[PDB]
């Protein structure tokens, strides 16, 4: 019922809420207790595919009925045809030592045979059962794409319309267009999280079906099998002519099978099936690192680079020096002519993306005067960290002029400090940590579009300093992660001075 969208500000407020809500809907999961453990369930799965959808809740109905309730063909198993068990009639009169070591051979053949049977059951599981969960995975993934498409079309129509007829300034439209593009990427990244969710959920389910449904049929088949074998082997040993009664009892005992001889279930192996080279490559290509700064000294050369595996380009003064920091070589910026710059399309930010910045910094603190250290700014938007007074200032400003300007006290003591900054658009929360403490926790609901350049510039004007382990992430950081980063890096076996 609202008045139509006219300002660019109104478009942003709209687009952001469109994005947050989409994220909340699509990434929804609930952890449940199952036969085989705790599984992280995709909440919308039933409403998407019409599966266990006749309830008012798919989640509780799935907790009730179990993993096998999601697929249409429940009993596909075929007990395999075996090779029946006969002990040769030529061993009936053998002497102990030879009888003994010949049954040892039969023992191994048997336990190997058990393993074969299990394999056969695993193959049937894959072919008959997993095939159906993979169908569910694909359809669920298609559902996510279908939904994503609906969203993007909704966004595209609104943008297309404002551009079509509205008084919004030409170059404001321009920014809107660039910014929306970044938001559409943010929406794919969110879609991707959801498609990973359905993969874990459904893979776990399929594995639970093997433990709960297939495996026990195997165990049934195997105790019938070793019960038989046990019989034939006892009957055989009694019929042995050339050994005595004390020998028979020790022999029957040596050769008897029990359930443990065939309990092959290894749940970690079940899980490791789905870790392929591809699954790994995808992890490394899609992880949160947008920048990971490394540095080291080659003979006659200082090396600086980015390990994120992203598109980051690095440009830096030729004479920048390196010095051992906390865990590695640190960059020395003299404050006068030296600068370094990192280029990634992600760095421009936008309306809807989240990110974290962290690094170690030691500043030989002199002046109180406000000076650029590091930031990304264009057309007076984006973020900057300044040296000021004895501390830092974190500045954040949007295209409408709304600002965060936050003083972090006492950071230039000429001691190393671990700076962590976290920007979370889903929770609308800014978090700033110094070392192991949380120095600022703020709402950023009032900050809208921070689109900046694709370049982050490390200047360190007027304040010679050391910078180490600079990192940019496309996700927010929690307090547990900060503590873990901080302390893990800190014990490398080195003792430190004040």
């Amino acid at each position: 019922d609202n008045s139509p969208i006219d300002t660019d500000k109104k478009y942003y407020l709209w687009l952001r809420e469109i994005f947050r809500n989409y994220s909340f809907d699509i990434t929804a999961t609930q952890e449940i207790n199952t036969n085989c453990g705790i599984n992280k369930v995709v909440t919308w799965f039933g409403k998407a595919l019409n599966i266990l959808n006749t309830s008012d809740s798919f989640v509780e109905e799935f907790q009730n009925l179990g993993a096998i309730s999601l697929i249409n063909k429940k009993e596909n198993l075929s007990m395999p045809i075996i090779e029946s068990y006969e002990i040769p009639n030529d061993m009936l009169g053998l002497p102990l030592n030879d009888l003994n070591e010949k049954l040892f051979n039969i023992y191994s053949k048997n336990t190997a045979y058990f393993k074969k049977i299990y394999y056969n059951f695993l193959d049937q599981w894959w072919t008959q059962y997993y095939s159906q969960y993979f169908d569910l995975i694909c359809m669920a993934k298609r559902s996510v794409l279908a939904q994503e498409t609906l969203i993007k079309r909704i966004i595209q129509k609104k943008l297309s319309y404002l551009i079509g007829n509205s008084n919004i300034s030409s170059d404001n439209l321009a920014l809107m267009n660039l910014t929306t593009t970044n938001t559409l990427r943010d929406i794919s990244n969110e879609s991707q999280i959801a498609m990973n969710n359905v993969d874990s959920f459904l893979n776990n389910a399929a594995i639970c079906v093997f433990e709960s449904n297939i495996y026990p049929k195997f165990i049934s088949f195997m105790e019938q099998c070793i019960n038989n074998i046990n019989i034939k082997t006892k009957e055989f040993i009694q019929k042995c002519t050339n050994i005595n009664e004390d020998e028979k009892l020790q022999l029957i005992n040596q050769n008897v099978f029990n359930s443990l001889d065939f309990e092959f279930l290894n749940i970690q192996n079940m899980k490791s099936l789905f870790s392929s080279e591809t699954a790994l490559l995808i992890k490394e290509e899609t992880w949160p690192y947008e920048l990971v700064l490394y540095a080291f000294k080659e003979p006659g050369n200082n090396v600086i680079g980015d390990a994120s595996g992203k598109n980051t380009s690095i440009e830096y003064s030729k004479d920048i020096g390196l010095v051992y920091g906390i865990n590695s070589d640190a960059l020395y910026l003299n404050g006068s002519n030296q600068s370094i710059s990192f280029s990634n399309d992600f760095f421009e930010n936008g309306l809807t993306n989240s990110f974290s910045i962290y690094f170690w910094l030691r500043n030989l603190g002199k002046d109180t005067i406000k000076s650029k250290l590091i930031g990304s700014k264009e057309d007076n938007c984006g973020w900057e960290i300044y040296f000021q007074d004895t501390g830092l200032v974190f500045n954040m400003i949007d295209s409408n002029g709304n600002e965060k300007n936050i003083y972090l006290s006492d950071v230039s003591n000429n001691s190393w400090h671990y700076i962590t900054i976290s920007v979370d658009r889903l929770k609308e929360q800014l978090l700033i940590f110094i070392d192991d403490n949380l120095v600022a926790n703020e709402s950023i609901k009032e900050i809208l579009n921070i689109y900046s350049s694709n370049i982050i510039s490390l200047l360190s004007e007027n304040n010679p300093s050391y910078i180490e382990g600079l990192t940019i992430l496309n996700k927010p950081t929690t307090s547990q992660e900060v503590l873990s980063n901080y302390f893990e890096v800190l014990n490398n076996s080195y003792i430190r001075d004040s």
Binding site: P80, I82, N120, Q124, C138, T278, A279, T286
Partner: protein
């Protein structure tokens, strides 16, 4: 693709993208890798032949058709017939 990668026709409807050498693709592979490569959709996507393995007809109580949906086969040959029932797991290893 790591799962049933010879059956994908059933699990997936493919949408094709043009690859130009060497602007999209060179001796190092896709420019900007397999994820972020910028490839144009092929105008051929609309020419793709669609022949469903089966069609799911969803009617209402009055026996009239609400929707007709397509399921596609994997392309592979079938049966015939059941392998697991008639396969004997070898006891002797040679």
């Amino acid at each position: 693709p790591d799962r049933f990668n010879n059956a994908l026709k059933h699990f997936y409807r493919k949408q094709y993208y043009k690859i130009d050498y060497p602007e999209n693709y060179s001796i190092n592979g896709f420019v900007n890798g397999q994820i972020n490569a910028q490839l144009s959709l092929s105008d051929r996507n609309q020419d793709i032949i669609n022949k469903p393995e089966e069609i799911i007809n969803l009617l209402n109580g009055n026996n009239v058709s609400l929707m007709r949906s397509n399921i596609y086969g994997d392309g592979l040959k079938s049966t015939v017939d059941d392998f697991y029932s008639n396969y004997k797991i070898p006891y002797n290893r040679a």
